[PDB]
């Protein structure tokens, strides 16, 4: 029973690793190329006919109108999430002087909103954090690397500034190395999925097992919401990394929890294949983590952890790579680069010309 | 709605989800859509 177990993850783990080839021929990757198949892909359905001005005029009701004209950025007066809008900023201000004109429809909400099973009114281009196959939106990298990511009482201001944090994560998996880590499975966030809910159930049935508790986010109604436990405390990031099993969910779509835990050093179980940021197409399972179907069961809890607890060092061997990939491929320049590329590519795609709208105003720099 | 959810009222606000967006309410020193303002 454990055997069957075992041979089957073994048997995907050797899989796995025998056909991996890292993102780039260096590690340091000059060029730009680590996340380039993702760029290529969500804007390749305009490759042909291109983005003409009626498309741009179409999509603007679907996220915040950002222009490019002249290397000054103009925007809707009105954005929907003002700290989202900052985050976005920091990264688009200082790639204005060399870059050409184009209007941007970037989507600041959570979930992603040109849907492949309507169109064409879904047709875009619209840009969004966060998508599965069934959407044509085009990923960028999160507002959260410099700001307005979710509120907590631990970071009133928005969880940003991931140059900080890289740093800060890293002092810690140096403080708490792998045999010291306690070997139990960790989450603690809100309720943003029932994903998340089997994990919570389990580790009420078995503490010694999963330390699993939901936190109250601001959209609180009922104690449904906790399944009607009293709210548990925020965990600081850095305090994750005392556990060596770190779970990641999907919430309204990707969370921004999965890339700081790989920063533990501790072995990441990452459930449901479908939400993606652009950085996870790199994330290989197996290679860099532990992938889990979604809506794991109680069961497959207890048989994953079971085997990874009597398979120690290919625990730490996974957990280091993971760390390493983001170490090495979601550095701030990744971020930047990821963004540059991304926007020269796009403007290529424009069939018409770029003219200002008195109504924008101006953002920098 | 569910954009509140995600924490969108910093410093401290509290939000509430109409249908079509949310709203943050900002405790006495910080303003703005989201409190990200000193008042
Ligand atoms: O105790 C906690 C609870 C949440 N978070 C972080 O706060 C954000 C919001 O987490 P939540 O589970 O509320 O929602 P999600 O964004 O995962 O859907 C995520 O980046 C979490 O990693 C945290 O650091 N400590």
């Known amino acids: 029973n454990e055997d069957e ?23 340091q990757d000059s060029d730009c190329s680590c996340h380039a198949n993702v760029l290529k892909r969500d804007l390749a359905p305009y490759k042909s006919t291109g983005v003409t001005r009626q498309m741009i005029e179409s999509s603007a009701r679907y996220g915040t109108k950002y222009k490019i004209y002249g290397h000054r950025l103009y925007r809707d007066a009105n954005c929907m999430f003002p700290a989202r809008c900052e985050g976005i900023e920091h990264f688009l201000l ?166 700081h835990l790989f920063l533990c050093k501790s072995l990441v179980f990452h459930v449901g294949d479908e939400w993606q940021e652009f950085f996870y197409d790199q994330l290989k399972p197996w290679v860099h983590y532990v992938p889990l179907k979604s809506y794991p069961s109680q069961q497959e809890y207890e048989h994953i952890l079971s085997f990874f607890k009597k398979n120690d060092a290919l625990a730490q061997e996974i957990a280091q790579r993971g760390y390493d990939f983001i170490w090495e491929h979601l550095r701030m320049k990744d971020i930047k680069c990821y963004w540059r590329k991304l926007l020269k590519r796009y403007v290529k795609l424009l069939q018409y010309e770029v003219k200002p709208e008195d109504q924008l105003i101006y953002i920098g720099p | 709605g569910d954009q509140c959810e995600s924490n969108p009222c910093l410093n401290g606000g509290s939000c509430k989800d109409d249908i079509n967006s949310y709203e943050c309410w900002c405790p006495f020193g910080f303003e703005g859509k989201n409190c990200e303002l000193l008042e």
């Open chain 1, 94 to 259: 200082p790639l204005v002087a060399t870059l050409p004109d184009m209007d941007l429809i970037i989507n600041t909400r959570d979930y992603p909103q040109l849907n492949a099973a309507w169109g064409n009114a879904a047709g875009g281009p619209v840009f969004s954090f966060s998508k599965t196959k069934e959407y044509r939106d085009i990923m960028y990298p999160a507002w959260t690397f410099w700001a307005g990511g979710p509120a907590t009482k631990l970071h009133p201001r928005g969880i940003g500034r991931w140059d900080q944090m890289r740093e800060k994560l890293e002092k810690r998996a140096a403080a708490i190395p792998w045999s010291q880590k306690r070997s139990l499975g960790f989450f603690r966030g809100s309720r943003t999925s029932d994903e998340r809910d089997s994990l919570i159930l389990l580790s009420r049935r078995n503490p010694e097992l999963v330390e699993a508790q939901y936190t109250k986010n601001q959209g609180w109604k009922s104690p449904k919401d906790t399944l009607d436990a009293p709210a548990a405390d925020e965990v600081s990031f850095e305090d994750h990394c005392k556990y060596k099993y770190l779970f990641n969910f999907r919430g309204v779509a990707a969370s921004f929890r999965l890339k």
């Open chain 1, 5 to 27: 177990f075992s041979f089957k993850i073994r048997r995907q783990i050797e899989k796995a690793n025998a056909d991996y080839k890292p993102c780039s021929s260096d590690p």
